[PDB]
Amino acid sequence: SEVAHRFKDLGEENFKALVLIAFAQYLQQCPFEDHVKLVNEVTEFAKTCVADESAENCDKSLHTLFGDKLCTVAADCCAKQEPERNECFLQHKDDNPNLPRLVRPEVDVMCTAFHDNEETFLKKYLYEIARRHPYFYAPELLFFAKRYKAAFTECCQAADKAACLLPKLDELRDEGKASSAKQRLKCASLQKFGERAFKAWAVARLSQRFPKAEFAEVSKLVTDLTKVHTECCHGDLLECADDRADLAKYICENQDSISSKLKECCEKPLLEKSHCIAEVENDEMPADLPSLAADFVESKDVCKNYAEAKDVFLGMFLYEYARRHPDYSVVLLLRLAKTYETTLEKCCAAADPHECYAKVFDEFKPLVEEPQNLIKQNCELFEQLGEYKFQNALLVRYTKKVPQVSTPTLVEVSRNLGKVGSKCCKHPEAKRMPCAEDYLSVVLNQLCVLHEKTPVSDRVTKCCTESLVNRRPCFSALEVDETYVPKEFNAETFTFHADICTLSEKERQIKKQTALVELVKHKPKATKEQLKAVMDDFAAFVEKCCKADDKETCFAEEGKKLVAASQAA
């Protein structure tokens, strides 16, 4: 029995949470009560299996069971069987579910609901997250759950809870979203590019982190880590959580052989141990490391070793170049690795290989400089305009690049792209690249998955599927879509009402930002000069109407003077 197996390993508390998340991610539209019902029904069945490991259908696989329990409340997916059925659900996960924005009741209400029924209060948090983020890293979701519990348990018995809770919750909302984003990239990598692309990313990344660890060790870690994510991304949550635990035990046992900063980590609860390890800082670089040129360019055995085991050899190249370059981003190392392999494949087929592949490092120079100059420039620019105007500049830049993309998506992606400046520019040159480029990877992956749902721009598709590691350079290289045909104005689209006054300070910018996007789609060829001169106007239209006697009509009157002057520029 598989269910009995995983139940014992995870316990009832985790087993129940993990199954709840699985159901929330598969059927994101179904209400909370229903999932809760199926979880219990499933959980009890599991208890009978622990005893009689041959009772009802304790012999069946998790998917069969989970599948049959969801099919009692869903249709074409359920008409299929075993493999096809499961794949069906996976293909129907929705990265942008049409769910109602989540609003939080007054502190007083939450603390009452928390104190009264704690298990329920926590199970609904899990449910509301898992249904909105169908790819959230299950094991980590359990970690956020506990921290959420600690938030309430502590703040609800204080002087001013509003002051104690609200903050801790915002920090959690953001970090939860970041977390969801990073995991969305790993699944896309696996699902759209293959495990080989995933493995290479891990080798380079872990080699940067555990520079003292041996290649064979990293390889071992990478292999386990791959299976872990392969499972979480495919919906095998229980085994994912299980396997993740094992990997944490291993890493801790073999500390000495991996990294010296794993101490603090291995001295704490499971959930906190895993989370700790996954976010540990890079270890100190081994003192005397030979030159790479020795074994990879000067040696006359290159092509022979390459021929013998192309995978192991290139894998070793990555590990070696990565370990001594924690100042490079993972994508830059992968571009280098790809440039090195391309040189061997051609050179090793020449008369005198050595001569041909002797200047491969000269090929690396341009690739390393591109990222640096880009970052340098844009951080300087960021420092000058600040985060709000920088987001605006990005909205104009990206709407011009790919005008077809839906206004909600452009607004969302550009805002996030703007956050890269705040999160990264503050670091010194040494840590900027990893920061900047790996964050751009996550955000542009967001644009790619939201766009894959309803493809409208061939330019987006090409930049998203041609190469995982070159997405950033591809998007960067786009200027303006010259074939794009301007859109015709729509009254409703540019009609500002008084309801924009009740909206938070941020909810306003977002509106003014959404207007900017529509404007650029209308006048692609317009200039950053005109645009700014027009935006300022919109600002004026809000301040007056929002504060001018009983006027829900100023929205139409003053909005008229708005569109009028708007149609002019």
Residue numbers in the entry: 5 to 78, 88 to 582
What does the publication say?
With a typical circulating concentration of around 0.6 mM, HSA is the most abundant protein in blood plasma and serves as an important transporter molecule. The monomeric 67 kDa protein has three structurally homologous α-helical domains (I-III), each subdivided into sub-domains A and B. HSA can also bind drug compounds with similar physiochemical properties to its natural ligands and may significantly impact the kinetics of their distribution and elimination. Later crystallographic analysis of complexes of HSA with specific compounds confirmed that drug sites 1 and 2, as they came to be called, are located in sub-domains IIA and IIIA, respectively.
Since fatty acid binding sites FA3 and FA4 in sub-domain IIIA overlap extensively with drug site 2, the binding of dansylated compounds specific for drug site 2 was examined by co-crystallising them with defatted HSA (Section 2). As was observed for dansylated amino acids bound to drug site 1, the dansyl group provides the most important anchoring interactions for binding DanF, DanNV and DanSRC in drug site 2. In each case the dansyl group occupies the same position in the binding site pinned between the side-chains of Asn-391 and Phe-403 on one side and Leu-453 on the other. The other oxygen atom of the SO2 makes a 3.0 Å hydrogen bond to the hydroxyl group of Ser-489 in the case of DanF; however, the distance between these groups is stretched to 3.7 Å for DanNV and to 4.1 Å for DanSRC. In the presence of DanF, DanNV or DanSRC, the side-chain of Arg-410 is rotated towards the solvent or becomes disordered. This rotation reveals a hydrophobic flanking wall of drug site 2 that has not previously been noted but which contacts the apolar side-chains of DanF and DanNV and the methyl group added to the sulphonamide in DanSRC. The main contacts made by these apolar functional groups are with the hydrophobic side chains of Leu-396, Phe-403, Ala-406, Leu-407 and the apolar stem of Arg-410. Instead of pinning the dansyl moiety in position — in the manner observed for DanN, DanE and DanR — the side-chains of Leu-238 and Ala-291 are found to hold the Phe side-chain of DanF. The dansyl group of DanF is re-located to the lower part of drug site 1, which was previously observed to be occupied by indomethacin; as with indomethacin, the binding of DanF induces a rotation of the side-chain of Trp-214 (∼140° about x2). Since DanF was found not to be displaced by binding of drugs specific to site 1, we conclude that the affinity of this compound for site 1 is much less than its affinity for drug site 2.
